[PDB]
mmCIF file of all heavy atoms in Angstrom:
data_model
loop_
_atom_site.group_PDB
_atom_site.id
_atom_site.type_symbol
_atom_site.label_atom_id
_atom_site.label_comp_id
_atom_site.label_asym_id
_atom_site.label_seq_id
_atom_site.Cartn_x
_atom_site.Cartn_y
_atom_site.Cartn_z
ATOM 1 N N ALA A 1 252.170 -65.124 137.789
ATOM 2 C CA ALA A 1 250.864 -65.549 137.298
ATOM 3 C C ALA A 1 250.440 -64.707 136.083
ATOM 4 O O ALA A 1 249.700 -65.185 135.213
ATOM 5 C CB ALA A 1 249.822 -65.431 138.387
ATOM 6 N N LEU A 2 250.922 -63.455 136.000
ATOM 7 C CA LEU A 2 250.826 -62.720 134.761
ATOM 8 C C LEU A 2 251.756 -63.286 133.704
ATOM 9 O O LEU A 2 251.480 -63.081 132.506
ATOM 10 C CB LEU A 2 251.127 -61.236 134.996
ATOM 11 C CG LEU A 2 249.985 -60.405 135.592
ATOM 12 C CD1 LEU A 2 250.479 -59.021 135.962
ATOM 13 C CD2 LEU A 2 248.893 -60.324 134.590
ATOM 14 N N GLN A 3 252.780 -63.984 134.087
ATOM 15 C CA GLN A 3 253.679 -64.557 133.077
ATOM 16 C C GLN A 3 253.151 -65.878 132.528
ATOM 17 O O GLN A 3 253.819 -66.443 131.657
ATOM 18 C CB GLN A 3 255.084 -64.704 133.629
ATOM 19 C CG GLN A 3 255.690 -63.401 134.150
ATOM 20 C CD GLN A 3 255.272 -62.170 133.352
ATOM 21 O OE1 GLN A 3 255.660 -61.991 132.213
ATOM 22 N NE2 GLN A 3 254.423 -61.365 133.977
ATOM 23 N N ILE A 4 252.073 -66.377 133.043
ATOM 24 C CA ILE A 4 251.365 -67.516 132.409
ATOM 25 C C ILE A 4 250.194 -67.007 131.554
ATOM 26 O O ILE A 4 249.960 -67.520 130.450
ATOM 27 C CB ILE A 4 250.916 -68.522 133.487
ATOM 28 C CG1 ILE A 4 252.123 -69.255 134.071
ATOM 29 C CG2 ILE A 4 249.913 -69.510 132.947
ATOM 30 C CD1 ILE A 4 251.788 -70.286 135.134
ATOM 31 N N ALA A 5 249.516 -65.963 132.036
ATOM 32 C CA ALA A 5 248.314 -65.476 131.380
ATOM 33 C C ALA A 5 248.534 -64.889 130.006
ATOM 34 O O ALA A 5 247.565 -64.741 129.240
ATOM 35 C CB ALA A 5 247.648 -64.416 132.256
ATOM 36 N N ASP A 6 249.763 -64.522 129.674
ATOM 37 C CA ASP A 6 250.061 -64.068 128.319
ATOM 38 C C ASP A 6 250.742 -65.106 127.480
ATOM 39 O O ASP A 6 250.986 -64.860 126.283
ATOM 40 C CB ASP A 6 250.910 -62.790 128.388
ATOM 41 C CG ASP A 6 250.167 -61.606 129.004
ATOM 42 O OD1 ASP A 6 249.020 -61.799 129.473
ATOM 43 O OD2 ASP A 6 250.708 -60.501 129.011
ATOM 44 N N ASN A 7 251.065 -66.271 128.044
ATOM 45 C CA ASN A 7 251.494 -67.403 127.259
ATOM 46 C C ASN A 7 250.413 -68.450 127.083
ATOM 47 O O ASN A 7 250.016 -68.793 125.973
ATOM 48 C CB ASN A 7 252.786 -67.986 127.871
ATOM 49 C CG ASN A 7 254.010 -67.163 127.524
ATOM 50 O OD1 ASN A 7 253.972 -66.297 126.652
ATOM 51 N ND2 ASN A 7 255.111 -67.409 128.247
ATOM 52 N N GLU A 8 249.858 -68.954 128.195
ATOM 53 C CA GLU A 8 248.624 -69.699 128.120
ATOM 54 C C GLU A 8 247.461 -68.762 128.390
ATOM 55 O O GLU A 8 247.647 -67.573 128.679
ATOM 56 C CB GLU A 8 248.616 -70.844 129.139
ATOM 57 C CG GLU A 8 249.657 -71.867 128.867
ATOM 58 C CD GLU A 8 249.381 -73.159 129.578
ATOM 59 O OE1 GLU A 8 248.338 -73.230 130.250
ATOM 60 O OE2 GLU A 8 250.201 -74.089 129.488
ATOM 61 N N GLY A 9 246.238 -69.278 128.257
ATOM 62 C CA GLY A 9 245.049 -68.426 128.291
ATOM 63 C C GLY A 9 244.765 -67.919 129.697
ATOM 64 O O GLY A 9 245.285 -68.380 130.719
ATOM 65 N N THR A 10 243.877 -66.911 129.748
ATOM 66 C CA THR A 10 243.473 -66.355 131.023
ATOM 67 C C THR A 10 242.643 -67.288 131.876
ATOM 68 O O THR A 10 242.536 -67.092 133.092
ATOM 69 C CB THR A 10 242.713 -65.054 130.812
ATOM 70 O OG1 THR A 10 242.254 -64.555 132.081
ATOM 71 C CG2 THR A 10 241.548 -65.251 129.887
ATOM 72 N N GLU A 11 242.030 -68.306 131.256
ATOM 73 C CA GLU A 11 241.436 -69.395 132.041
ATOM 74 C C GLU A 11 242.522 -70.208 132.687
ATOM 75 O O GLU A 11 242.344 -70.694 133.841
ATOM 76 C CB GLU A 11 240.563 -70.254 131.155
ATOM 77 C CG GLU A 11 239.792 -71.349 131.875
ATOM 78 C CD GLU A 11 240.495 -72.684 131.872
ATOM 79 O OE1 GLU A 11 240.818 -73.183 130.760
ATOM 80 O OE2 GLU A 11 240.728 -73.243 132.946
ATOM 81 N N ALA A 12 243.637 -70.419 132.002
ATOM 82 C CA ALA A 12 244.708 -71.249 132.532
ATOM 83 C C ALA A 12 245.408 -70.562 133.678
ATOM 84 O O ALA A 12 245.993 -71.207 134.563
ATOM 85 C CB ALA A 12 245.699 -71.605 131.430
ATOM 86 N N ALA A 13 245.384 -69.208 133.714
ATOM 87 C CA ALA A 13 246.020 -68.471 134.793
ATOM 88 C C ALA A 13 245.238 -68.651 136.087
ATOM 89 O O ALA A 13 245.846 -68.720 137.169
ATOM 90 C CB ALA A 13 246.161 -67.024 134.430
ATOM 91 N N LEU A 14 243.917 -68.668 135.998
ATOM 92 C CA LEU A 14 243.106 -68.896 137.194
ATOM 93 C C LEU A 14 243.255 -70.301 137.715
ATOM 94 O O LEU A 14 243.127 -70.556 138.911
ATOM 95 C CB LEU A 14 241.646 -68.575 136.899
ATOM 96 C CG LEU A 14 241.405 -67.085 136.658
ATOM 97 C CD1 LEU A 14 240.078 -66.835 135.979
ATOM 98 C CD2 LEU A 14 241.455 -66.377 137.979
ATOM 99 N N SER A 15 243.536 -71.276 136.812
ATOM 100 C CA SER A 15 243.778 -72.635 137.253
ATOM 101 C C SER A 15 245.111 -72.753 137.962
ATOM 102 O O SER A 15 245.256 -73.557 138.869
ATOM 103 C CB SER A 15 243.734 -73.589 136.055
ATOM 104 O OG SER A 15 243.893 -74.924 136.499
ATOM 105 N N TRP A 16 246.095 -71.928 137.565
ATOM 106 C CA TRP A 16 247.382 -71.974 138.229
ATOM 107 C C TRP A 16 247.335 -71.332 139.612
ATOM 108 O O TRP A 16 248.117 -71.728 140.489
ATOM 109 C CB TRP A 16 248.424 -71.273 137.373
ATOM 110 C CG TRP A 16 249.804 -71.440 137.896
ATOM 111 C CD1 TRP A 16 250.644 -72.465 137.627
ATOM 112 C CD2 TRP A 16 250.467 -70.588 138.834
ATOM 113 N NE1 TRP A 16 251.814 -72.285 138.308
ATOM 114 C CE2 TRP A 16 251.722 -71.153 139.052
ATOM 115 C CE3 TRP A 16 250.131 -69.425 139.465
ATOM 116 C CZ2 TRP A 16 252.667 -70.577 139.906
ATOM 117 C CZ3 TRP A 16 251.052 -68.839 140.311
ATOM 118 C CH2 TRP A 16 252.292 -69.407 140.539
ATOM 119 N N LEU A 17 246.399 -70.413 139.825
ATOM 120 C CA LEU A 17 246.395 -69.652 141.062
ATOM 121 C C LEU A 17 245.854 -70.473 142.249
ATOM 122 O O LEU A 17 246.169 -70.164 143.398
ATOM 123 C CB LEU A 17 245.577 -68.395 140.916
ATOM 124 C CG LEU A 17 246.365 -67.305 140.188
ATOM 125 C CD1 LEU A 17 245.425 -66.323 139.508
ATOM 126 C CD2 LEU A 17 247.215 -66.600 141.200
ATOM 127 N N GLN A 18 245.035 -71.479 141.991
ATOM 128 C CA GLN A 18 244.466 -72.273 143.085
ATOM 129 C C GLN A 18 245.410 -73.364 143.561
ATOM 130 O O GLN A 18 245.373 -73.740 144.728
ATOM 131 C CB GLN A 18 243.130 -72.868 142.662
ATOM 132 C CG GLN A 18 241.990 -71.912 142.583
ATOM 133 C CD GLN A 18 240.672 -72.597 142.308
ATOM 134 O OE1 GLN A 18 240.579 -73.817 142.412
ATOM 135 N NE2 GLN A 18 239.647 -71.819 141.984
ATOM 136 N N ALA A 19 246.235 -73.886 142.659
ATOM 137 C CA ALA A 19 247.111 -75.028 143.033
ATOM 138 C C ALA A 19 248.467 -74.551 143.501
ATOM 139 O O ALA A 19 249.502 -75.001 143.017
ATOM 140 C CB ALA A 19 247.197 -75.970 141.853
ATOM 141 N N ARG A 20 248.496 -73.635 144.455
ATOM 142 C CA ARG A 20 249.703 -73.281 145.169
ATOM 143 C C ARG A 20 249.575 -73.692 146.602
ATOM 144 O O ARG A 20 248.542 -73.333 147.242
ATOM 145 C CB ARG A 20 250.006 -71.788 145.068
ATOM 146 N N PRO A 21 250.520 -74.416 147.190
ATOM 147 C CA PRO A 21 250.255 -75.140 148.428
ATOM 148 C C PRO A 21 250.219 -74.307 149.693
ATOM 149 O O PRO A 21 249.889 -74.858 150.761
ATOM 150 C CB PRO A 21 251.442 -76.141 148.494
ATOM 151 C CG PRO A 21 252.102 -76.064 147.143
ATOM 152 C CD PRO A 21 251.875 -74.676 146.663
ATOM 153 N N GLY A 22 250.527 -73.033 149.624
ATOM 154 C CA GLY A 22 250.693 -72.241 150.858
ATOM 155 C C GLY A 22 249.420 -71.773 151.502
ATOM 156 O O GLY A 22 249.455 -71.317 152.661
ATOM 157 N N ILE A 23 248.281 -71.879 150.817
ATOM 158 C CA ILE A 23 247.068 -71.206 151.290
ATOM 159 C C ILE A 23 246.407 -72.018 152.403
ATOM 160 O O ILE A 23 245.549 -72.892 152.163
ATOM 161 C CB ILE A 23 246.135 -70.923 150.116
ATOM 162 C CG1 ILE A 23 246.110 -72.071 149.117
ATOM 163 C CG2 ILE A 23 246.566 -69.672 149.384
ATOM 164 C CD1 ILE A 23 244.943 -72.005 148.154
ATOM 165 N N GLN A 24 246.744 -71.700 153.654
ATOM 166 C CA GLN A 24 246.153 -72.440 154.784
ATOM 167 C C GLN A 24 245.243 -71.515 155.562
ATOM 168 O O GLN A 24 244.053 -71.766 155.734
ATOM 169 C CB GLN A 24 247.243 -72.970 155.696
ATOM 170 C CG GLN A 24 248.160 -74.003 155.088
ATOM 171 C CD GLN A 24 249.217 -74.446 156.040
ATOM 172 O OE1 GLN A 24 249.340 -73.922 157.174
ATOM 173 N NE2 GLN A 24 250.046 -75.382 155.631
ATOM 174 N N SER A 25 245.812 -70.446 156.093
ATOM 175 C CA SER A 25 245.089 -69.544 156.967
ATOM 176 C C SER A 25 244.185 -68.620 156.167
ATOM 177 O O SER A 25 244.366 -68.423 154.953
ATOM 178 C CB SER A 25 246.040 -68.703 157.808
ATOM 179 O OG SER A 25 245.395 -67.551 158.306
ATOM 180 N N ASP A 26 243.211 -68.035 156.841
ATOM 181 C CA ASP A 26 242.183 -67.246 156.222
ATOM 182 C C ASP A 26 242.644 -65.914 155.677
ATOM 183 O O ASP A 26 241.952 -65.301 154.879
ATOM 184 C CB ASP A 26 241.049 -67.047 157.232
ATOM 185 C CG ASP A 26 241.569 -66.571 158.567
ATOM 186 O OD1 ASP A 26 242.794 -66.476 158.710
ATOM 187 O OD2 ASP A 26 240.745 -66.306 159.449
#
């Protein structure tokens, strides 16, 4: 996710962090 934030913008890195399918449990 740091390897996106220095290629695309730091707004785009936060968009990448939510769309990962594993986040189920608290």
Side-chain angles (χ1 to χ4, degrees), residues 1-19 21-26:
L2 281 172
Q3 303 325 289
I4 289 180
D6 293 6
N7 282 346
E8 296 198 3
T10 175
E11 186 264 305
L14 291 163
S15 183
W16 188 88
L17 281 156
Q18 286 186 12
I23 40 166
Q24 296 178 357
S25 160
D26 49 355

